[PDB]
Amino acid sequence: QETTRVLTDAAINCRSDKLNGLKENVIIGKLIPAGTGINRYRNIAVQPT
């Protein structure tokens, strides 16, 4: 909400996003950091016993 003012004052502040919420990870299309996306479950090594 209020895209213009947020965008312009973020541009002034040079505010760097860190891409760690559940929305900015949806906007850019990479895997979200919740559920099956976090590194605890996303990096499981599976070998036959």
Partner: protein, 50 residues
């Protein structure tokens, strides 16, 4: 691939002049009711006095 236009005269961005609170106004301590008179060629300003 993007392009660009080389303007023959400098122009001001609208987001930093018109959107309240005006950012040019706060940076320069100028009132928007008067900043509009400047940037739309309605009133002079002094850029340097000796």
């Amino acid at each position: 691939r993007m392009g660009h236009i080389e303007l023959a005269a400098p122009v001001t961005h609208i987001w930093y002049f018109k959107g309240v609170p005006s950012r040019l106004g706060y940076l320069l301590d100028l009132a928007p009711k008067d900043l509009e008179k400047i940037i739309y060629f309605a009133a002079y300003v002094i850029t340097s006095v000796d």
